[PDB]
């Protein structure tokens, strides 16, 4: 069931903003590890005395990396005279966020029809305001409300190139890397209490619950009208034998925050080949692969969707496969992106639900909890 | 003249420590950009609840990248019960350093015969103490004094593998990158006032002035007895047409700090080929090359040291060449390593002064100020 209860018109995920200590080094690492090209910048070279912001793109996926300069460079500015290109930026907020949480996602940005209306409707329906709507160069409006922890949901709307004040990056500095990643599929938060978080977010967005189908968590998924904006939220389950990974996250992150970003690839085999070649030369590492019994058991589960050779390629790359009543999901998790065991990335590709492909085709991998446990048991014996 | 006036026995540069917001991303970027392998770690996986520290090596060059975890993970510890592997580390100091200066060098570490004696002699001769001598696992002693700004000179002495508590990195995570870099040649500080800085450092070390031979600076070089530890210091010169790059550094760094690290290569042509191939795929960018007239003028200057083809290879790679009365220097500068126009890297190789090669053979490139200016003028006409 989909009541289509969005309280304002939502289009698609627009960008993810990471708050960093040094945006240059994080952006360069991510560019090489994920195959994203440098697309836009706002920094000292573009007249921005407040923050350094670098935009990477792959297909429709946009990752923004921002860090503050010394406040002394902008000490004479006031908000009406700011050289910042992102008017919600604040030196103290950014330093406090990074000191508290380490490297991580500050903003989940969605494109909407009208960011001023989305902000007003959200706040009228219980959203905690974070940054009021600001019109940039009479062309783009940006507004922010609190999502969970210190993560904001950012609304962006365009009258008609990322944001005014950003400059496109010179071709010499923009190498055309591409490992096949094409868009953000879902963005997942970890919170101490699922119920209150769901009530808050669904309360102000009108997003509906997306149907699914002891592992240490309870989860639920909120979705926009066309189910292309997908926001799962996890809470810990205490008392289990193995300590909840959600609780570990909350301890190391100093509270709620974004847990994982799931990036859709148009060719997950190519993406994983390219990312794994780079794991030990500056890129990203991947979680340990399931034992061969898991891929043995794939034949009975997905043998009508993947050939034996396609199953063998999943095994060579450590890819997991799940399936619900509508489609099939190929997925894999990276190790944490930075020093703390907090945020990580998921690479996914979905098979089925062709109408365009409907959002969330194949679910989120819930079936891989039981399958992985059984697979470990079978491999031991 | 070399009075050999060192007040304690100094061996060689040992390591450089960067203080970071996220050590993982900076270390991974530097590893790929410079061709340094991951050699040792001290982090949550090794029992360190205080800081994440990753060691990269290339030859004898050691770069350490350290960032703090949440203080909550170690809130029950006291110094006698610390899980930190570097006992001088402090969460507040590291966060304050990074907020003030951005990504940069916290420690210039030199190996000495006895770090406790070096500390005592230094402090008795005016050094400002920063961290007292601490013996680690009855095997290594570490002590720190203030050098300039918030940079420390770290003394390390070994009874007889980086430091106790560090674990060697698994072969799967240690890809054997190598672009030819072999050791740290010199480490250069920028200060507001050269005279007081020189008097302070030479006062407590006994390091002597190393002989050299409007550009916006005055400089001098301090050297150990065998002239293998080389510490140049720059001050700005005000009033010039073009604004002093030393003054720009001090403004963006919030005061004195380490300006550049000069890394010796055993094959500068190979190093630059490898680094330039990676500039736009996660590595380091280089300063704009001199015009072809500069390489035209190289024949009259160094035609007895470099063949025409070797001069052509210098031109293809943007390498500069200087020469004094004893040797020849090949050198090139990177663009700043992070967001701020502060720290950068120099790659160098020295030709001559064979006895082993004596330290500082060929100078530091002072002749390239006049040569570059004349070269720009000639290229214009
Ligand atoms: C409903 C929420 C909570 C999560 O259940 C879901 C994860 O993404 C699950 O994904 C996986 C579960 C188990 C094993 C995996 C192994 C590799 C990659 C993903 C795996 C999230 O997105 C939406
Ligand atoms: C005495 C101190 C002050 C500096 O004069 C020296 C620099 O390293 C100079 O180096 C260069 C000067 C001019 C042009 C260059 C172009 C490329 C690479 C290096 C170049 C430093 O080490 C020790
Ligand atoms: Co997921
Ligand atoms: Co130099």
Curated annotation (Swiss-Prot), chains A, B:
Pfam families: Glyoxalase (PF00903). It comes from the Eukaryota. GO terms for cellular component: cytoplasm. InterPro entries: 4OHPhenylPyrv_dOase, 4OHPhenylPyrv_dOase_C, 4OHPhenylPyrv_dOase_N, Glyas_Bleomycin-R_OHBP_Dase, Glyas_Fos-R_dOase_dom, VOC. GO terms for molecular function: 4-hydroxyphenylpyruvate dioxygenase activity; identical protein binding; iron ion binding. The keyword Ribosomal protein does not apply. Gene3D superfamilies: 2,3-Dihydroxybiphenyl 1,2-Dioxygenase, domain 1. PROSITE patterns: VOC (PS51819). Its main location: cytoplasm. Transmembrane segments: none annotated. It is an enzyme of class 1 (oxidoreductase). Binds 1 Fe cation per subunit. Its cofactor is Fe cation. Residues 12-158, 183-335 form the VOC domain. Fe cation binds at residues 186, 260, 346. It is found in: Cytoplasm. Keywords: Cytoplasm, Dioxygenase, Iron, Metal-binding, Oxidoreductase, Phenylalanine catabolism, Repeat, Tyrosine catabolism. It catalyses: 3-(4-hydroxyphenyl)pyruvate + O2 = homogentisate + CO2. Pathway: Amino-acid degradation; L-phenylalanine degradation; acetoacetate and fumarate from L-phenylalanine: step 3/6; Cofactor biosynthesis; prenylquinone biosynthesis. Its EC number is 1.13.11.27. One of its GO terms (biological process) is tyrosine catabolic process. Belongs to the 4HPPD family. Homodimer. Catalyzes the conversion of 4-hydroxyphenylpyruvic acid to homogentisic acid, one of the steps in tyrosine catabolism. This is 4-hydroxyphenylpyruvate dioxygenase. It comes from Arabidopsis thaliana (Mouse-ear cress). The lineage of its organism: Eukaryota, Viridiplantae, Streptophyta, Embryophyta, Tracheophyta. The gene is HPD.
């Amino acid at each position: 069931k989909n009541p289509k209860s969005d309280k304002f018109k939502v289009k698609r995920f627009h960008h993810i903003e990471f708050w960093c200590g040094d945006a240059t080094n994080v952006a360069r690492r991510f560019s090489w590890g994920l195959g994203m090209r440098f697309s836009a910048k706002s920094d000292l070279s573009t007249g921005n005395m407040v923050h350094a912001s670098y935009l990477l793109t792959s297909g429709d996926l946009r990752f923004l990396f921002t860090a503050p300069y010394s406040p002394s460079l902008s000490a004479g500015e006031i908000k009406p005279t700011t050289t910042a290109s992102i008017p919600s930026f604040d030196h103290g907020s950014c330093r406090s966020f990074f000191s508290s949480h380490g490297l991580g996602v500050r903003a989940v940005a969605i494109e909407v029809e009208d960011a001023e209306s989305a902000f007003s409707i959200s706040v009228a329906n219980g959203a905690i305001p974070s940054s009021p709507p600001i019109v940039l160069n009479e062309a783009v409006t940006i507004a922010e409300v609190k999502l969970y922890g210190d993560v904001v949901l950012r609304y962006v709307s365009y009258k008609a190139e990322f944001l005014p004040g950003f400059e496109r990056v010179e071709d010499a500095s923009s190498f055309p890397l591409d490992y096949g990643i094409r868009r953000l599929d879902h963005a997942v938060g970890n919170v101490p209490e699922l119920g209150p978080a769901l009530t808050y977010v669904a309360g102000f967005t009108g997003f509906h619950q997306f149907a699914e189908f002891e592992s240490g968590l309870n989860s639920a998924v909120l979705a926009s009208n066309d189910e292309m904006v997908l926001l799962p939220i996890n809470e810990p389950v205490h008392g289990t034998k193995r300590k909840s990974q959600i609780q570990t996250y909350l301890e190391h992150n100093e509270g709620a925050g974004l847990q994982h970003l799931a990036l859709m690839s148009e060719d997950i085999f190519r993406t994983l080949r390219e990312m794994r070649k780079r794991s030990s030369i500056g890129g990203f590492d991947f979680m340990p692969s399931p034992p061969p019994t898991y891929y043995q058991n794939l034949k009975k589960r997905v043998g009508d969707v993947l050939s034996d050779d396609q199953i063998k390629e999943c095994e060579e790359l450590g890819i997991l496969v799940d399936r619900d009543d509508q489609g099939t999901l190929l997925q894999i998790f990276t190790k944490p992106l930075g020093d703390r065991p907090t945020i990580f990335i998921e690479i996914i590709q979905r098979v089925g639900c062709m109408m365009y492909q409907s959002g969330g085709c194949g679910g989120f991998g819930k079936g891989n909890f039981s399958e992985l446990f059984k697979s470990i048991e079978e491999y031991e014996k």
